[PDB]
Amino acid sequence: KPLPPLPLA
Amino acid sequence: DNFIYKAKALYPYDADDDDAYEISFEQNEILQVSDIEGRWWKARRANGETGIIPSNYVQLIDGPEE
């Protein structure tokens, strides 16, 4: 399963 | 092997209801984690909740511990 994108920095 | 580690959430995560092995957590929440060889880690929250977490959302802060 791919990792979620990181949220807004 | 048996090791458990401590991780601090860098951001909140909301687990989907559709994938029911994931757990949610809050930014700055401290989690106990294990099986950290891959990308999704095993976690336990202070409240006893247990499941998998995206490793890119957390930072390792202690461990290993038996």
mmCIF file of C-alpha atoms in Angstrom:
data_model
loop_
_atom_site.group_PDB
_atom_site.id
_atom_site.type_symbol
_atom_site.label_atom_id
_atom_site.label_comp_id
_atom_site.label_asym_id
_atom_site.label_seq_id
_atom_site.Cartn_x
_atom_site.Cartn_y
_atom_site.Cartn_z
ATOM 1 C CA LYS A 1 0.000 0.000 0.000
ATOM 2 C CA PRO A 2 1.463 3.402 -0.803
ATOM 3 C CA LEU A 3 2.076 5.947 1.942
ATOM 4 C CA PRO A 4 -0.220 8.941 2.069
ATOM 5 C CA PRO A 5 1.121 12.265 0.899
ATOM 6 C CA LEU A 6 2.426 14.453 3.720
ATOM 7 C CA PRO A 7 0.112 17.255 4.606
ATOM 8 C CA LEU A 8 0.715 20.914 3.934
ATOM 9 C CA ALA A 9 3.978 22.208 5.536
ATOM 10 C CA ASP B 1 12.712 -9.378 16.812
ATOM 11 C CA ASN B 2 10.936 -8.211 19.983
ATOM 12 C CA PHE B 3 11.830 -4.437 19.932
ATOM 13 C CA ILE B 4 9.307 -1.608 20.551
ATOM 14 C CA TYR B 5 10.044 2.009 19.820
ATOM 15 C CA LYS B 6 8.512 5.384 20.645
ATOM 16 C CA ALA B 7 7.394 7.756 17.842
ATOM 17 C CA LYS B 8 6.022 11.341 17.884
ATOM 18 C CA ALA B 9 3.409 12.329 15.295
ATOM 19 C CA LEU B 10 4.607 15.192 13.052
ATOM 20 C CA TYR B 11 1.071 15.653 11.758
ATOM 21 C CA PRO B 12 -2.429 14.328 12.458
ATOM 22 C CA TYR B 13 -3.642 11.323 10.522
ATOM 23 C CA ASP B 14 -7.222 10.324 9.892
ATOM 24 C CA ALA B 15 -7.539 6.612 9.136
ATOM 25 C CA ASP B 16 -10.202 5.719 6.523
ATOM 26 C CA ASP B 17 -13.175 3.702 7.642
ATOM 27 C CA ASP B 18 -12.694 1.615 4.432
ATOM 28 C CA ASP B 19 -9.258 0.323 5.500
ATOM 29 C CA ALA B 20 -10.077 -0.774 9.062
ATOM 30 C CA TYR B 21 -6.564 -1.764 10.196
ATOM 31 C CA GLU B 22 -5.313 1.839 10.224
ATOM 32 C CA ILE B 23 -5.523 4.042 13.314
ATOM 33 C CA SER B 24 -5.880 7.800 13.565
ATOM 34 C CA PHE B 25 -3.684 10.010 15.720
ATOM 35 C CA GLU B 26 -3.029 13.679 16.630
ATOM 36 C CA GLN B 27 -0.095 15.923 15.893
ATOM 37 C CA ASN B 28 2.502 15.618 18.721
ATOM 38 C CA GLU B 29 0.877 12.450 20.065
ATOM 39 C CA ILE B 30 3.418 9.910 21.357
ATOM 40 C CA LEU B 31 2.843 6.356 20.042
ATOM 41 C CA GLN B 32 4.488 3.027 20.799
ATOM 42 C CA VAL B 33 5.506 1.392 17.515
ATOM 43 C CA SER B 34 7.034 -1.846 16.246
ATOM 44 C CA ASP B 35 7.798 -3.679 13.007
ATOM 45 C CA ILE B 36 9.456 -0.542 11.678
ATOM 46 C CA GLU B 37 11.342 -2.316 8.815
ATOM 47 C CA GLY B 38 8.738 -1.218 6.257
ATOM 48 C CA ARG B 39 6.599 1.783 5.393
ATOM 49 C CA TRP B 40 3.481 1.050 7.465
ATOM 50 C CA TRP B 41 4.287 0.535 11.153
ATOM 51 C CA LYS B 42 2.381 -1.227 13.985
ATOM 52 C CA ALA B 43 1.235 1.330 16.614
ATOM 53 C CA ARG B 44 -0.449 1.496 20.013
ATOM 54 C CA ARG B 45 -2.024 4.700 21.304
ATOM 55 C CA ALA B 46 -2.097 5.632 25.030
ATOM 56 C CA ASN B 47 -5.846 4.838 24.962
ATOM 57 C CA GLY B 48 -5.103 1.245 23.994
ATOM 58 C CA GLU B 49 -6.094 1.591 20.303
ATOM 59 C CA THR B 50 -3.964 -0.589 18.068
ATOM 60 C CA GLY B 51 -3.383 -0.691 14.303
ATOM 61 C CA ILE B 52 -1.076 0.413 11.503
ATOM 62 C CA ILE B 53 0.244 3.900 10.798
ATOM 63 C CA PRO B 54 1.978 5.718 7.868
ATOM 64 C CA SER B 55 5.639 5.971 8.957
ATOM 65 C CA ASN B 56 6.166 9.260 7.069
ATOM 66 C CA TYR B 57 3.731 10.965 9.523
ATOM 67 C CA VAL B 58 5.897 10.231 12.607
ATOM 68 C CA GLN B 59 9.421 10.607 13.972
ATOM 69 C CA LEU B 60 11.243 8.005 16.086
ATOM 70 C CA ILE B 61 12.128 9.459 19.480
ATOM 71 C CA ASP B 62 13.076 6.454 21.632
ATOM 72 C CA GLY B 63 13.980 2.775 21.538
ATOM 73 C CA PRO B 64 14.719 0.056 21.037
ATOM 74 C CA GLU B 65 13.113 -1.497 24.140
ATOM 75 C CA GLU B 66 12.391 -5.102 25.114
#
